[PDB]
C-alpha cells in the first residue's frame, strides 16, 4: 500500500471514489486486499458478476464469487459497481442458441432481475448494457439486437430500474476517448434520444483503455460525453499502455474538470494481473509498489 490514498484525495476534491477491479482470486493473494483497503474506495468485480459466472445454465444461478466480493466490500467500507448484465461476450451457449424474441426477452429480464434483487440496495451503480456500439456508431449486431431488436436497450434499463431503484444505471463502452471519433458522438446522440423517450439511463461509462499519449484527448472527449445530459459519467476500466504519468494525470484532470464525473476505476491493481500485462499499464508494479504514475496522481490531487 501507498501511504497516500488516491481515493481519500479525490474525495477531498469533491468526487465520489477512486476504485479498482478485483475479485476473490485477487483478494486472497499477494498484497491486493491491503492495497484496496488503504488506497481505493470502490471495487468492480472483474468476472464474478458476468453472465457466464452467474447463470451457466438457465435458472441455475451461482453467486459464490459475487457474494464473496460484495461481503468483502461491505465489511471494508467500499462502494460496489456491478459489472455487467447484458453483454455479448462471456455469454453462455444456452443464451445465444435462443432465436425466439419472447423467450430471449424473458430470459434477459430474469437475469437482470435476479442479480439486481439479490444485492438490492448494496450496489451503487450497474453496467446494465456493455459494448453495445460498433466503431462507426451503429449498434453492434449481437444476439440481443438480432433477436429482440433495438428495444433490447430500453427493456434492459427499464427492467433494471424496477429491480433496484437505488442503483445508478450505466451504459458502458470503450473507444470513447476522442471527441472527433464517430463512436463518441454516436453514444451521446443515442443516449440523448433514449432519455428523451423516458429510458432510465443514469450514466455513461467510458472504459478508457488507452495507448500511450491518448490521455490528452480525454480532456475534450469527457466533456462531450457529459453533454448527453446524464446525471453521471464515470471512467470505468482505466489502464494506459506504458503507464506514463502524463496520460494518467490527464485522465484524472478530465474527470476533475467535468462536474458530472463521479469517479474513476482502474482495471486492476498490479501490472502482472492486468488483462494487458505486456504493456505494464497499471499503477502498481509486480512487487506491489506504487509506480511514478500513482505518485503523480497523488501530487495532482493534493
Amino acid at each position: 500500500q501507498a501511504a497516500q490514498s488516491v481515493d481519500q484525495l479525490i474525495k477531498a476534491r469533491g468526487k465520489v471514489y477512486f476504485g479498482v477491479a478485483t475479485d476473490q482470486n485477487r483478494l486472497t493473494t499477494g498484497k491486493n486486499a491491503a492495497i484496496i483497503q488503504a488506497d481505493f474506495g470502490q471495487v468492480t468485480p472483474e468476472n464474478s458478476m458476468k453472465w457466464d459466472a452467474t447463470e451457466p445454465s438457465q435458472g441455475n444461478f451461482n453467486f459464490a464469487g459475487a457474494d464473496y466480493l460484495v461481503n468483502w466490500a461491505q465489511q471494508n467500507g467500499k462502494l460496489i459497481r456491478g459489472h455487467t448484465l447484458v453483454w455479448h461476450s462471456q455469454l453462455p451457449s444456452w443464451v445465444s442458441s435462443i432465436t425466439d424474441k419472447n423467450t430471449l426477452t424473458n430470459v434477459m429480464k430474469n437475469h437482470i432481475t435476479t442479480l439486481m434483487t439479490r444485492y438490492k440496495g448494496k450496489i451503487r451503480a450497474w453496467d446494465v448494457v456493455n459494448e453495445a456500439f460498433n466503431e462507426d456508431g451503429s449498434l453492434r449486431q449481437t444476439v440481443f439486437l438480432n433477436v429482440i431488436g433495438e428495444d433490447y436497450i430500453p427493456i434492459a434499463f427499464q427492467t433494471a430500474r424496477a429491480a433496484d431503484p437505488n442503483a445508478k444505471l450505466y451504459i458502458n463502452d470503450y473507444n470513447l476517448d476522442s471527441a472527433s471519433y464517430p463512436k463518441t458522438q454516436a453514444i451521446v446522440n443515442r443516449v440523448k434520444q433514449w432519455r428523451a423517450a423516458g429510458v432510465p439511463i443514469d450514466g455513461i461509462g467510458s472504459q478508457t483503455h488507452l495507448s500511450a499519449g491518448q490521455g490528452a484527448g480525454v480532456l475534450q472527449a469527457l466533456p462531450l460525453l457529459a453533454s448527453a445530459g446524464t446525471p453521471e459519467v464515470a471512467i470505468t476500466e482505466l489502464d494506459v499502455a506504458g503507464a506514463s504519468p502524463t496520460d494518467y494525470v490527464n485522465v484524472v484532470n478530465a474527470c476533475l474538470n467535468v462536474q458530472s464525473c463521479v469517479g474513476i476505476t482502474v482495471w486492476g491493481v498490479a501490472d502482472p494481473d492486468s488483462w494487458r500485462a505486456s504493456t505494464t499499464p497499471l499503477l502498481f508494479d509486480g512487487n506491489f509498489n506504487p509506480k511514478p504514475a500513482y505518485n503523480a496522481i497523488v501530487q495532482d490531487l493534493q
Side-chain angles (χ1 to χ4, degrees), residues 207-212 214 237-243 248 267 270-282:
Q207 290 184 19
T208 318
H209 295 295
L210 300 182
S211 294
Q214 291 181 332
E237 308 183 13
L238 175 60
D239 50 27
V240 184
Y248 267 107
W267 209 242
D271 280 352
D273 297 323
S274 172
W275 74 297
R276 320 161 64 200
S278 68
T279 69
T280 61
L282 292 179

Side-chain angles (χ1 to χ4, degrees), residues 23-294:
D23 253 337
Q24 180 180 337
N25 60 342
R26 309 304 184 203
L27 290 167
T28 58
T29 56
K31 296 186 162 59
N32 296 299
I35 289 168
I36 300 172
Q37 280 170 341
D39 292 330
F40 294 107
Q42 173 268 324
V43 292
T44 301
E46 184 184 324
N47 285 295
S48 64
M49 291 187 192
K50 292 170 177 171
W51 199 319
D52 58 349
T54 56
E55 200 187 357
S57 174
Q58 180 173 158
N60 287 250
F61 287 83
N62 186 347
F63 297 112
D67 287 347
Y68 184 101
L69 185 60
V70 171
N71 289 337
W72 187 92
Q74 285 197 270
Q75 288 177 192
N76 289 282
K78 310 301 178 187
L79 299 175
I80 306 158
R81 298 184 79 267
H83 177 81
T84 178
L85 298 169
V86 183
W87 190 29
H88 64 283
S89 306
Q90 289 181 256
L91 188 70
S93 69
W94 67 263
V95 184
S96 56
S97 293
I98 299 165
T99 56
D100 181 70
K101 174 181 173 78
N102 295 332
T103 297
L104 190 59
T105 300
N106 290 350
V107 157
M108 186 187 69
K109 290 184 188 171
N110 186 60
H111 184 83
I112 292 167
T113 299
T114 297
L115 266 60
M116 289 185 71
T117 183
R118 182 172 187 90
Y119 305 116
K120 184 175 183 165
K122 299 186 187 197
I123 309 299
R124 174 196 197 273
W126 279 94
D127 295 327
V128 177
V129 172
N130 198 41
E131 296 181 3
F133 288 81
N134 289 320
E135 298 306 303
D136 64 5
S138 60
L139 291 177
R140 187 190 290 275
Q141 291 195 324
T142 67
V143 62
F144 299 108
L145 187 75
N146 291 340
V147 175
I148 302 173
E150 304 200 357
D151 281 357
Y152 88 91
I153 293 166
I155 296 168
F157 279 96
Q158 290 192 133
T159 300
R161 171 73 85 231
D164 186 359
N166 303 291
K168 302 297 170 284
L169 306 180
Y170 280 64
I171 189 162
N172 191 53
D173 223 321
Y174 64 90
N175 289 168
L176 314 178
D177 309 309
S178 168
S180 61
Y181 196 65
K183 198 181 190 180
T184 312
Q185 312 181 321
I187 195 160
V188 166
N189 284 345
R190 291 309 290 262
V191 168
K192 276 196 181 192
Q193 285 179 23
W194 279 322
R195 284 183 48 86
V199 183
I201 306 175
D202 303 308
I204 299 172
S206 184
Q207 290 184 19
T208 318
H209 295 295
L210 300 182
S211 294
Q214 291 181 332
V218 179
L219 291 167
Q220 287 99 11
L222 197 63
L224 183 62
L225 294 175
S227 77
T230 58
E232 303 189 356
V233 298
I235 299 296
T236 56
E237 308 183 13
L238 175 60
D239 50 27
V240 184
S244 164
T246 308
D247 288 311
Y248 267 107
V249 168
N250 272 337
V251 174
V252 170
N253 285 344
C255 184
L256 296 173
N257 291 166
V258 171
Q259 187 230 78
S260 61
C261 184
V262 290
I264 300 167
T265 307
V266 170
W267 209 242
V269 173
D271 280 352
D273 297 323
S274 172
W275 74 297
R276 320 161 64 200
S278 68
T279 69
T280 61
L282 292 179
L283 295 172
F284 292 81
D285 70 16
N287 292 116
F288 296 99
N289 292 317
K291 293 164 66 179
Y294 186 94

